Amino acid sequence: GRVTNQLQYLHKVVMKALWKHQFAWPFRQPVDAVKLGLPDYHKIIKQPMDMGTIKRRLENNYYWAASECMQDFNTMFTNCYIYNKPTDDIVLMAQTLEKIFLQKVASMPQE
Numbered sequence: 565g566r567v568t569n570q571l572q573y574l575h576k577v578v579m580k581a582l583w584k585h586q587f588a589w590p591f592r593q594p595v596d597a598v599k600l601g602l603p604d605y606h607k608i609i610k611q612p613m614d615m616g617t618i619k620r621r622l623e624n625n626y627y628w629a630a631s632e633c634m635q636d637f638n639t640m641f642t643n644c645y646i647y648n649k650p651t652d653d654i655v656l657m658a659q660t661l662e663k664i665f666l667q668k669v670a671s672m673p674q675e
């Protein structure tokens with residue numbers, strides 16, 4: 565639809581909801597493989613993404629299309645499912661956030 569209305573919705577509705585969720589705090593800033601002691605993070609994960617980057621991108625008019633911003637969200641979730649083992653707590657927190665993301669996206673404006 566209208567790119568501006570869609571991106572405002574991603575920022576004002578989708579992102580604000582996910583940012584304030586009780587599972588959000590591991591994703592407000594980039595993964596720090598050193599401090600977490602993740603030796604092979606940047607080996608296995610080639611496109612790191614966090615909610616802080618997406619937020620800054622939305623606020624700086626980085627995106628040309630809602631689907632770009634949606635792709636960055638998806639990369640953040642996908643990175644988490646890939647680097648981690650199926651039963652780590654972060655996997656379930658990412659899954660919880662991602663479902664809300666898809667719920668919200670189903671109500672994105674088209675004009």
Ligand SMILES: O=c1cc(N2CCOCC2)oc2c(-c3ccc4c(c3)OCCO4)cccc12
Nearest residue numbers: 590591595596600602643644645647648652654
């Ligand atoms: O995919 C990820 C990989 C890991 N791992 C570390 C431990 O969990 C297993 C593997 O953490 C991530 C974190 C994270 C950030 C800060 C933390 C945290 C986790 O845990 C408590 C202490 O502050 C955030 C986003 C993605 C991942």
Ligand SMILES: [Cl-]
Nearest residue numbers: 590652653654
């Ligand atoms: Cl954790």
Ligand code: NA
Nearest residue numbers: 653654656657
């Ligand atoms: Na948990």
